[PDB]
Write an enzyme that holds these catalytic residues in place. Structure first.
Site, mmCIF file in Angstrom:
data_model
loop_
_atom_site.group_PDB
_atom_site.id
_atom_site.type_symbol
_atom_site.label_atom_id
_atom_site.label_comp_id
_atom_site.label_asym_id
_atom_site.label_seq_id
_atom_site.Cartn_x
_atom_site.Cartn_y
_atom_site.Cartn_z
ATOM 1 N N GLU A 1 -13.310 60.704 73.083
ATOM 2 C CA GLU A 1 -14.701 61.122 73.054
ATOM 3 C C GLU A 1 -15.473 60.461 74.186
ATOM 4 O O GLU A 1 -15.308 59.262 74.454
ATOM 5 C CB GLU A 1 -15.328 60.766 71.713
ATOM 6 C CG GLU A 1 -14.494 61.134 70.518
ATOM 7 C CD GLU A 1 -15.273 60.957 69.215
ATOM 8 O OE1 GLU A 1 -14.980 60.018 68.432
ATOM 9 O OE2 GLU A 1 -16.195 61.766 68.998
ATOM 10 N N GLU B 1 -13.603 58.638 53.661
ATOM 11 C CA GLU B 1 -13.507 57.469 54.529
ATOM 12 C C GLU B 1 -14.789 56.642 54.418
ATOM 13 O O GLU B 1 -15.827 57.106 53.916
ATOM 14 C CB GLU B 1 -13.279 57.871 55.979
ATOM 15 C CG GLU B 1 -14.440 58.630 56.552
ATOM 16 C CD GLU B 1 -14.338 58.823 58.047
ATOM 17 O OE1 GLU B 1 -13.563 59.694 58.482
ATOM 18 O OE2 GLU B 1 -15.044 58.111 58.791
#
Ligand SMILES: [Ca+2]
Length: 876
Positions: free
Chosen positions: A252, A138
């Site tokens: 998160e 990525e």
């Protein structure tokens, strides 16, 4: 440290659940961060794959100690594998590249890249005796040198990925360790899939948030792009459906913008537990999602599984700080999602209810997969060649097979729809997607048609009845009739079979007919084949590719002369209504086969949207269909189908009168040498396009180009265009073409008078107001040319030139050929020569090369002879 040896575990079986545990949320990582309250060892057995996701800027040495000695044995004992995640970077070297930072120990050489791959598995897998290696591919992990993306490092990472694949994974020396790729990229954008795919056990796609689910949105066409189905299809080229896992993200703590996926339930004060409910979440939709073709997927995975159960802050409600507090998870979302996949219809096993015949069930299980979901999706080949099959019952449950092969099943007496795949006949897809869609696309979403299975039958020496009626089958190809020695009844009616004589369909049909009439009664019910409506296709090749015809005052329709006809998939050419009625009433054993309803306009192709491109010998092009014969000219006709106007479907040369040679545009791709025109658009004048989309503007109001033909030849013509779309008021109104004779003033060669200061010769001087201008020219062999143009407006005139053509024949160094025929009559211009008794011959030639150069037929052989002949007189 005392690392325990690997305890035994069962093989991984789908559906699989994965989770990325962030190491800085393990209790033992920083015994000073007393808010860190979770532990990797507490993950439940529903987790098949626990990825160690680390902050590489920390030590956490106490955690790796707990990982190797307590957590891995604890997790392995419940069947959970512990996978080390590493960034892509680690295979490249460069910035923050882990082991590979030591470029002196692991140089980028064949031997050094093999050493690095081994050091990588030693350090990141074998050191804590983990179960495999997951390389995250990525944007955030890309190879970089000094903060800049490294194309070299990417190239290197491919080499090191392969080399790791020789150590672990399905092709590795140690097949007990998984080799996993996880990526955000579509396959065409993944630089490592093409070489890496054979080496990995599993491919994980990170598809967090509504953009992962629906795809991104293409605002210009208002259509989704990179949809979940497109992403899978891009990797289906490389891996098996059961290798594919799709990922969502928990929430998160203190996530910034761009890290807000909403993959789990948004918080609600009135239900403090809704974070742990999954029904209707994107994560539940991923648990339920299945590709429409290929097979059922391998499973799903979460990012940040230590946050399992925290609810998601509201998109545009107030600050909720409770959600950002760290709490001990119960892993309730994960357990539920796993149960959702385990209890899903797709993953039910294929058993005796689907296929009673034991030997058939085992050939389907072996080729299609073990899961009922694959019956709905598998779209490859199914070969049935075990003669021990006594019943083909069940095959109707196969929905999208590409090809069925029935080979030597001596015990099968009947074949009909009840024992054939559902897509024996045209059908649409009935699966329904669980995903959200962009309502900003109020367009299609329509059930795509399933291609029909190809049917191969051979060696079914006990087959007594073949019934394929009503299936819209397009051919009989694949039926080895000569092995169906036991046929008694055949029905092939109501299909698209071209059974006309000479076709391979007919041969298969006739061989079966031989088998049945040698048998008993061949009644009106015993061998039926009528009501065929075969598809009319376009002829791949046409009949007339050349026509010589005399000069006459006639307008001829070129399309009626050269382009017509329809063709069945077996090759039966039908040019007319009359042709087709002859076809309609063809017969087999006293019975016609073409359907009585099947009109000619029903069957027949059309040429409504077809295009013609007629080009004469002087390169003049028109798209007029009706061509006049009034003019001695030779043409090149081309036809273009609407679906493609770059390659023609048919082409043919039409000669009126005596054939002239086809000239070429020698100016194509010419190099711009000089003049005042803009160099970028000056180049475009010769690239070859008559109406360039791009700007053709040369200056503000008068312009010149000095240019150089790539291959110099013999020039007989020129042409230049104004672009339509503009008013005649802005057309070029005066043009001057000049050729550079008397080669290279002051010469200098590499040093180059950009020919700006010499005596050139004017070849043409145009003065008009037309869109296209074309003119014959008198045999120039110049390599250097200059054009000057003027549209007669103000100084801010912006004069424009789409294309200029210098037209003639390819003749290598024709300037020397010209310099001689010119010097030949000027050595007959010295004329202080006797040779009158001599030179009947010196003249029977400058009037024979002259006469051969000016002949409509260009014979390169003749002139290269006649010219080399006359310079036999350089010896006087
Ligand atoms: Ca052009």
């Amino acid at each position: 440290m005392k690392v325990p040896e690997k305890i035994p575990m069962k093989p991984l079986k789908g559906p699989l659940y994965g989770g990325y545990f962030r190491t800085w949320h393990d209790k033992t990582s920083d015994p000073a961060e007393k808010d860190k309250v979770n532990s990797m060892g507490e993950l439940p057995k529903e987790v098949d794959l626990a990825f160690v996701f680390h902050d590489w800027t920390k030590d956490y040495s106490l955690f790796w100690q707990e990982l190797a000695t307590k957590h891995v044995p604890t997790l392995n004992k419940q069947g959970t594998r512990v996978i080390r995640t590493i960034p892509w970077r680690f295979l490249a070297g460069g910035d923050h590249s882990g082991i590979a930072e030591d470029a002196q120990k692991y140089p980028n050489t064949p031997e050094g890249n093999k050493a690095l791959a081994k050091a990588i598995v030693d350090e990141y897998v074998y050191k804590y005796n983990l179960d495999g290696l997951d390389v995250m591919i990525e944007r955030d992990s890309i190879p970089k040198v000094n903060k800049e993306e490294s194309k070299e490092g990417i190239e290197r990472s491919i080499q090191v990925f392969e080399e790791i694949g020789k150590l672990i994974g399905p092709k590795g020396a140690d097949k007990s360790r998984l080799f996993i790729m996880d990526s955000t990229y579509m396959a065409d954008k993944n630089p490592l899939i093409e070489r890496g795919a054979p080496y990995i056990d599993l491919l994980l796609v990170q598809v967090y948030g509504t953009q992962g689910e629906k795809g991104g949105f293409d605002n210009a066409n208002h259509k989704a792009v990179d949809t979940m189905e497109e992403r899978w299809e891009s990797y289906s080229k490389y891996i098996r459906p059961e290798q594919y896992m799709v990922g969502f993200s928990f929430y998160e703590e203190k996530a910034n913008s761009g890290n807000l996926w909403y993959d789990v339930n948004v918080e609600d004060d009135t239900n403090p537990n809704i974070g742990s409910e999954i029904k209707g979440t994107r994560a539940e939709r991923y648990a339920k999602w299945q590709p429409k073709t290929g097979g059922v997927k391998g499973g799903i995975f979460s990012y940040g599984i230590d946050r399992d159960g925290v609810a998601h802050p509201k998109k545009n409600g107030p600050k909720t700080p409770d959600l950002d507090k760290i709490v001990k998870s119960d892993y309730k979302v994960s357990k539920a999602l796993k149960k959702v996949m385990e209890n899903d219809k797709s993953y039910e096993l294929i058993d005796q209810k689907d296929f009673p015949d034991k030997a058939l069930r085992e050939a389907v299980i072996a080729q299609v997969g073990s899961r009922r979901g694959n019956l709905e999706r598998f779209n490859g080949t199914l070969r049935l060649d075990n003669p021990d099959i006594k019943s083909l019952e069940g095959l109707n449950k196969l929905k999208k097979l590409a090809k069925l092969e029935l080979i030597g099943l001596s015990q099968i007496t009947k074949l009909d729809s009840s024992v054939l795949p559902e897509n024996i006949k045209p059908t649409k897809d009935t699966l329904v997607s669980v995903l959200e869609t962009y309502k900003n696309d109020d367009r299609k979403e329509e059930a795509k048609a399933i291609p029909q299975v190809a049917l191969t039958i051979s060696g079914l020496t006990g087959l007594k009845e073949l019934n394929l009626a009503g299936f819209d089958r397009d051919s009989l190809a694949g039926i080895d009739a000569a092995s169906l020695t036991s046929l008694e009844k055949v029905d092939l009616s109501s299909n698209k079979l071209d059974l006309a004589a000479g076709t391979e369909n007919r041969q298969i049909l006739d061989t079966m007919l031989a088998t049945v009439t040698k048998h008993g009664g061949v009644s009106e019910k015993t061998f039926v084949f009528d009501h065929q409506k075969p598809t009319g296709l376009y002829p791949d090749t046409y009949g007339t590719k050349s026509l010589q015809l005399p000069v006459a005052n006639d307008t001829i329709d070129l399309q009626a002369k050269l382009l017509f006809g329809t063709v069945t998939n077996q090759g039966t050419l039908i040019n007319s209504e009359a042709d087709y009625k002859a076809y309609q009433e063809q017969e087999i054993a006293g019975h016609r086969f073409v359907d009585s309803s099947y009109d000619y306009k029903a069957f027949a192709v059309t040429y409504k949207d077809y295009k013609i491109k007629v080009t004469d010998s002087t390169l003049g092009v028109t798209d007029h269909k009706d061509l006049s014969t009034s003019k001695e000219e030779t043409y090149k006709v081309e036809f273009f189908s609407p679906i493609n106007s770059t390659k023609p479907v048919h082409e043919a040369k039409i000669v009126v009168g005596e054939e002239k040679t086809m000239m070429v545009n020698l100016a194509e791709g010419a190099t711009i040498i000089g003049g005042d025109a803009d160099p970028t658009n000056a180049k475009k004048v010769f690239d070859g396009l008559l109406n360039n989309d791009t700007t053709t503007l040369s200056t503000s109001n008068k312009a010149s180009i000095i240019f150089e033909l790539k291959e110099p030849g013999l020039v007989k013509h020129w042409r230049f265009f104004n672009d339509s779309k503009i008013s005649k008021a802005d057309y070029i109104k005066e043009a001057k073409l000049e050729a550079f004779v008397g080669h290279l003033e002051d010469s200098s060669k590499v040093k180059d008078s950009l020919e700006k200061s010499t005596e050139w010769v004017t070849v043409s001087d145009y003065s008009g107001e037309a869109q296209e201008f074309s003119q014959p020219l008198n045999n120039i062999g110049a390599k250097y040319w200059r054009i000057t143009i003027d549209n007669k407006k103000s100084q801010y005139g912006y004069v424009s030139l789409p294309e200029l053509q210098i037209i003639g024949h390819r003749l290598p160094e024709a300037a020397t050929v010209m310099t001689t025929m010119a010097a030949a009559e000027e050595l007959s211009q010295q004329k202080d020569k006797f040779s009158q008794e001599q030179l009947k011959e010196l003249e029977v030639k400058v009037a024979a090369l002259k006469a051969a150069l000016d002949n409509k037929m260009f014979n390169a052989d003749t002139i290269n002879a006649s010219f080399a002949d006359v310079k036999a007189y350089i010896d006087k």
